[PDB]
Design a protein around this ligand. Structure first.
Ligand SMILES: [Mg+2]
Ligand SMILES: [Mg+2]
Ligand SMILES: [Mg+2]
Lengths: 48, 79, 48, 129, 49, 103
RNA sequence: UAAUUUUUUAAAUAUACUUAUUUAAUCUAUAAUUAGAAUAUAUUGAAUCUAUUCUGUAUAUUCUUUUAUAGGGGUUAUAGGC
């Protein structure tokens, strides 16, 4: 369970980082959905 | 101070010392409709909620436009 | 909070229906098609 | 035709760039200095390396797709989203940058030329002394 | 952002950095006729010798 | 321009009814959640929908902490060249020679 | 308890004046609003019929346009000569 973060590998652009010529796959301020889930607030509201 | 003497017989005064009409027009034209549309729509979206048919929904809107276009017909009658 | 969940239900359902068309046609492109292979790929690419 | 040059053309040539320093890319022409800057960037850019590997293939797939329609008497035609997505950079928001008292005044007419000299003092005037 | 606008003396002194006489010559090298100088340095020598 | 103002308004009006200031249905919304909460399908719904729209991202961006701001992708290759380490000069010596030999 | 007018000598400074040389037309920042054109995408509406079109709005781009706010500075954009 270290399958959560997200990286770009800015040094070796294309070999390590696939499909980088498509924007939706690659953001400038990417999300971490696990944080969004694991905030206790967000769990309360849905149960609310 | 008010006066200072430069030299002999040379006196001089020294110099080295919410519009309503816009307050109305800005209210009539700009502020009313932006306050009205938020009201005039929310009074309708609630009314569209209880309904489940799509015929009435698209006729009330098109009736709302007619009743709102007359508002402009009166303005162009003015100067 | 609850409104913004309805803001998902539209999009997730939109993205689902659009996808489930392509999935149906690749089952058809396996059979009904001159040029089966590309239609399996074209309908993927438009999903990207 | 040999381009003669003048006594004055020597000030800029050597004072700007000293002979002690080595020679570098900045000493070259710009049209060549750019190609290096392209050769050093295109190896990393995803677009150019993708579009150029596949350029011939787009030129063929459009023909094979077209010949169907000539075989199936329908006029040729193009579909939507046959191609990949490529960045439309205009739609994307990129940075523009990476990152006492005196006065002397003149005035003029047809031929005259006035010069004013204001000093602090009483109301007092002179013209040509 | 230092001014490219240069006055005369800098444009003058910038020239003298590159030109320089020699006592036997009294003629300048950096103007472009340095080749013609090296004749006269030899001619004065070949005559006496 | 009397005929113009009439047209522009009616389309401004039509756009606003498409906005949803309220809930549409509740049985659908609750059934939508129970299905996805059953097995943890929520995260996929958040990631994918957040990518091809910013409005849902803006709402959820606040719940997130520890943000990162990479450069923009198009300006990335240029960003790497400017930040060339001393080691990368090893490349640039070669890439300087490869072109000089051409010229 | 002053220092007028004029002449002369020595030095610095930039502001007329003299010379050379560069540029010269209609602006920004924002907003609303008007007038309209070109593309591309999305899209409401219109079919008594070329709806593989037309129109309208938004988005981005490409020049154009009214007013407002604030602030920014004008002619040479012309007239002769050869
Ligand atoms: Mg004169
Ligand atoms: Mg001067
Ligand atoms: Mg002149």
């Amino acid at each position: 369970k270290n399958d959560d973060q997200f990286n770009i590998d800015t040094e070796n652009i294309i070999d390590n980082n696939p499909s980088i010529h498509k924007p939706l796959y690659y953001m400038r301020s990417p999300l971490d959905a696990k944080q969004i889930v694991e905030n206790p607030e967000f769990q309360k509201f849905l149960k609310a | 101070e008010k006066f200072r003497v430069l030299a002999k017989k040379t006196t001089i005064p020294n110099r080295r010392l919410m519009p309503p009409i816009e307050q109305f027009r800005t209210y009539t034209k700009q502020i009313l409709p932006q306050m009205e549309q938020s009201i005039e729509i929310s009074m309708l979206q609630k009314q569209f909620q209880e309904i489940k048919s799509e015929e009435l929904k698209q006729d009330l809107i098109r009736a709302y436009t007619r009743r709102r276009i007359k508002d402009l017909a009166n303005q162009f009658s003015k100067l | 909070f609850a409104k913004n969940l309805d803001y998902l239900r539209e999009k997730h359902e939109e993205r689902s229906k659009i996808i489930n068309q392509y999935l149906h046609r690749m089952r058809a492109a396996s059979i009904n098609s001159n040029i089966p292979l590309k239609e399996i790929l074209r309908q993927f690419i438009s999903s990207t | 035709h040999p381009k003669e040059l003048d006594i004055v053309d020597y000030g800029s040539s050597n004072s700007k760039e000293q002979e002690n320093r080595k020679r570098g890319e900045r000493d070259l022409s710009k049209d060549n200095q750019i190609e290096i800057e392209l050769y050093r960037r295109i190896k990393t850019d995803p677009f150019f390396r993708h579009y150029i590997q596949n350029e011939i293939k787009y030129f063929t797939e459009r023909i094979e797709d077209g010949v169907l329609d000539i075989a199936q008497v329908i006029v040729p035609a193009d579909r939507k989203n046959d191609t990949p997505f490529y960045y439309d950079p205009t739609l994307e928001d990129i940075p523009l940058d990476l990152i006492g008292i005196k006065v002397f005044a003149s005035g003029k007419r047809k031929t005259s030329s006035c010069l004013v000299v204001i000093k602090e003092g009483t109301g007092k005037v002179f013209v040509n002394n | 952002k230092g001014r490219q606008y240069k006055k005369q003396k800098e444009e003058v002194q910038a020239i003298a950095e590159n030109v320089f006489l020699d006592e036997e010559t009294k003629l300048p090298y950096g103007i472009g006729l340095d080749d013609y100088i090296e004749l006269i340095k030899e001619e004065s020598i070949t005559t006496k010798t | 321009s009397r005929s113009g103002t009439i047209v522009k308004t009616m389309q401004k009006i039509s756009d606003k009814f498409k906005v949803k200031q309220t809930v549409a249905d509740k049985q659908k919304l609750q059934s939508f959640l129970t299905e996805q909460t059953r097995d943890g399908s929520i995260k996929e719904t958040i990631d994918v929908t957040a990518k091809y729209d910013a409005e849902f991202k803006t709402f959820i961006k606040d719940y997130q902490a520890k943000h990162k701001q990479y450069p923009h992708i198009l300006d990335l290759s240029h960003y790497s060249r400017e930040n060339s380490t001393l080691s990368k000069s090893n490349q640039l010596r070669q890439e300087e020679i490869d072109m000089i030999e051409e010229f």
